[PDB]
Amino acid sequence: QWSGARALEALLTVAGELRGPPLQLDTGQLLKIAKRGGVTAVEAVHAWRNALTGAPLNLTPEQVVAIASHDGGKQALETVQRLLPVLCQAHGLTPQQVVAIASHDGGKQALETVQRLLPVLCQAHGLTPEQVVAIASHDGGKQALETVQALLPVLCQAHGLTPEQVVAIASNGGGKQALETVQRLLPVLCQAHGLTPQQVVAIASNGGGKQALETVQRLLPVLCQAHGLTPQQVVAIASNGGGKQALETVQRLLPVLCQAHGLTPQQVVAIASNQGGKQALETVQRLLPVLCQAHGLTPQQVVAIASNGGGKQALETVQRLLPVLCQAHGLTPQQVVAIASHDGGKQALETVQRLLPVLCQAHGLTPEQVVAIASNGGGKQALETVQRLLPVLCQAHGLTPEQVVAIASHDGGKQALETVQRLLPVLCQAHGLTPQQVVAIASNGGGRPALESIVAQLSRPDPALAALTNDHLVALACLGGRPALDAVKKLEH
DNA sequence: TGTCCCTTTGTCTCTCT
DNA sequence: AGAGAGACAAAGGGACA
């Protein structure tokens, strides 16, 4: 018989119990732990169900699932209950920071290494705890911490990088590989091809940073003479997760796409310059003629859809959903293209298909409004949040549907909507801002942190901004959000 | 296998102006 | 408002004990 049978059975026996107190996990959360943390992780969560939930740690189930759903999850769980007090008392980290460090493959290694190396990293190397946490919060975080300790001096001194740059390089999966490749390849890339340190840092600062740097070195000559690419265009392609794959695919498919479809190299670069660019290119080669047939989508529209992260997913989803969204939902092809032309286009298309009739019939929005909500990165999240929160925001908080749609119609719209529902009362009743001002602050990208920064300043006033009135602070917060307040917070110093 | 580390792709959020 | 950064997640492969 199949050997995985006993184990699968054990998985299900134990999984059944976890639906009960004190954790109560759903099928989705249980699948997740099983898929990545495996069987021993599911058994571990059960074994330490009580010791984590409340006294004296007090971890939410969502947090227990986050620690458990990785390779070694069992080990991370044991280590968290051991090291979270140590790290919150002896180094002053928050439980959230400890959880974030724990929530990656080999989390036990990262936590123990942070416990070991944080003092030497802050004292002898002048890093902040936040920076130590960031470095540590990726797979192989133990390796990245140890490589930062060893290579920070030689990277700042012999190679001219700032600590911030070293931290940025180190704070991805395979950070150790990226750091080491930069030490070796920075003079080669700078002095042989005229790249700035900053361009090299940008290449190095993604997962697979090492792969992308080595690929830039190899392919930069062939890309710049033969295919007529600018060093600037090559750097942009390489400056993305899986840069190596995007680069190699650009060399392959640039002439093919240009000659056979009439795309410019500028358009090709834009398709290639996201995470999964490789996938976006190969999909365009296949799918463009299919999308463009019968006077359907123009090439230019296919390029736009292609030119975002997961462009492959967006392209395929349009091919599937263009007819059913146009015909049965009364959308123009142009509107479908608008919704698809953002990171997560696939998610957003699917969510419009599912929710357009609900939001229209049940909540009284127009299609135009639904499209406007959908037509940003994270459009799925914003649509789901408008569905959840429109009744409370309008009925309990006074807002018009028009104001809710405005808040929702930017990247982070979900975050903006949730924060408004959360902070509207204290902003208006405790400090006298008008609802229209709160809406105004929140109706920009970065709505959430702009609102948080404002609430911070009115509940624990920094003298640095006391010279500003509430209205001035509002105008500032609408002008440039949290960064503008923060800058002002300094300009005064 | 269980654990650790590395790489790619997809999605979401905030910044920079 | 569009490009850039970066953060978080899901999933697969190498390595090894």
Numbering used by the authors: 231 to 723
Sentences from the paper on this structure:
In addition, given the resemblance between Asn and Gln, we generated one more dHax3 variant where the base recognition residue of repeat 7 was replaced by Gln. We then attempted to co-crystallize these proteins with a modified dHax3 box element whose 7th base is changed from A to G. Four complex structures were determined at high resolutions. Gln34, just as Asn34, is able to form an H-bond to the O6 atom of G, indicating a favorable interaction. There was no report of G-recognition by Gln34. Nevertheless, an independent study showed that Gln34 is highly specific for base G, but not for base A. Therefore, Gln34 may be a good code that can discriminate G from A. It was shown that His34 is a strong code for base G, but not for base A. The structures shown here provide the molecular basis for the distinctive recognition of G and A by His34. Notably, the newly determined structures reported in this manuscript show that His34 forms H-bond with base G, but not with base A, which consolidates the genetic observation that His34 is a strong and specific code for base G. The structures also suggest that Gln34 and Asn34 are both strong codes for base G. Gln34, highly specific for base G, was not reported before and should be further exploited. His34/Gln34 → G and Asp34 → C can be used as strong codes.
Transcription activator-like (TAL) effectors specifically bind to double stranded (ds) DNA through a central domain of tandem repeats. Each TAL effector (TALE) repeat comprises 33–35 amino acids and recognizes one specific DNA base through a highly variable residue at a fixed position in the repeat. The crystal structures of TAL effector (TALE) proteins bound to their respective target DNAs have revealed that the residue at position 13 is the only one directly involved in DNA base recognition, whereas the 12th residue stabilizes the proper loop conformation. dHax3, an engineered TALE protein, proved to be a useful scaffold for structural characterizations. We then present fifteen crystal structures of engineered dHax3 variants in complex with target DNA molecules, which elucidate the structural basis for the recognition of bases adenine (A) and guanine (G) by reported or uncharacterized TALE codes.
